[PDB]
Design a protein around this ligand. Structure first.
Ligand SMILES: [Ca+2]
Ligand SMILES: [Ca+2]
Length: 214
C-alpha cells in the first residue's frame, strides 16, 4: 500500500547519497582530496578534521538507511517503473526516465534482471563497510550500463550526462576514459578499471579517508 511509495523515497535518497559519495571518491572538483588540497598552511589538519566529520555523518545516514532497508523489508521486488516516476518529480531535466533507469539498474550486480531490496541492502553495505575494491567493483557496474562486462566511452559519456542533469559537460568523459582505457582500444575491463583508480593518487587518498571514519 503506502509503504511502497515510501520505501521508494528512502530508495531515492540512497541513490542521491550514492552519487554524492561516488563523486566524493573521484569516481565521477567535488573530490574529498580536491577539497583537501584547496586548504592552506596551518589549516590542512583543520580541514582534514572537517572532511572527516562530514564524511562521518554520511556514514551514519548510510548506517541508518542500511539498518532500515535491512530489518524492515529485505525481500525484493523494487520496480524500476514507479522508481523512474519519483526520480523525475525531483530530478527532472531531460530524458530523466532513462537516467533513472541506468542509475537504478546499477544496483543489479549479478545482472539478475531487475533490482531487489537485497541489492540495495548489499550496495549500501558495500559503501558502509566493504573495501575500496568492492567499492570500485560497484562503481564499475554503474558505468557498465548494458552490463556486458566492459565500458564504452559512450556508456561513460551517458552517465556523465545522466548526472549533470540530475544536479544542475561531455568532453571530460574522453580524458577520464583515457585514464581507464589503458590498452587504448575503446573498452575498459574491471581489472583495467581498478588498476587505474588504484594507481591514481587522488581517487585513492579520497576513498582512503572515507573508509576509516567508522
Ligand atoms: Ca559496457
Ligand atoms: Ca581496454
Amino acid at each position: 500500500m503506502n509503504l511502497e511509495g515510501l520505501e521508494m523515497i528512502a530508495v531515492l535518497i540512497v541513490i542521491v547519497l550514492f552519487v554524492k559519495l561516488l563523486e566524493q571518491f573521484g569516481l565521477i572538483e567535488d573530490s574529498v582530496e580536491d577539497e583537501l588540497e584547496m586548504a592552506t598552511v596551518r589549516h590542512r589538519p583543520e580541514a582534514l578534521e572537517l572532511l572527516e566529520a562530514q564524511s562521518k555523518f554520511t556514514k551514519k545516514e548510510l548506517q541508518i538507511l542500511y539498518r532500515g532497508f535491512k530489518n524492515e523489508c529485505p525481500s525484493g521486488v523494487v520496480n524500476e517503473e514507479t522508481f523512474k516516476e519519483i526520480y523525475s518529480q525531483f530530478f527532472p531535466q531531460g530524458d530523466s526516465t532513462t537516467y533513472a533507469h541506468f542509475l537504478f539498474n546499477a544496483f543489479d550486480t549479478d545482472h539478475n534482471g531487475a533490482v531487489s531490496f537485497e541489492d540495495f541492502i548489499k550496495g549500501l553495505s558495500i559503501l558502509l563497510r566493504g573495501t575500496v575494491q568492492e567499492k570500485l567493483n560497484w562503481a564499475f557496474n554503474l558505468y557498465d550500463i548494458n552490463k556486458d562486462g566492459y565500458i564504452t566511452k559512450e556508456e561513460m559519456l551517458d552517465i556523465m550526462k545522466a548526472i549533470y542533469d540530475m544536479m544542475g559537460p561531455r568532453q571530460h568523459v574522453e580524458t577520464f576514459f583515457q585514464k581507464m582505457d589503458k590498452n587504448k582500444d575503446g573498452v575498459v575491463t574491471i581489472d583495467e578499471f581498478i588498476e587505474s583508480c588504484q594507481k591514481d593518487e587522488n581517487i585513492m587518498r579520497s576513498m582512503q579517508l572515507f573508509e576509516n571514519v567508522i
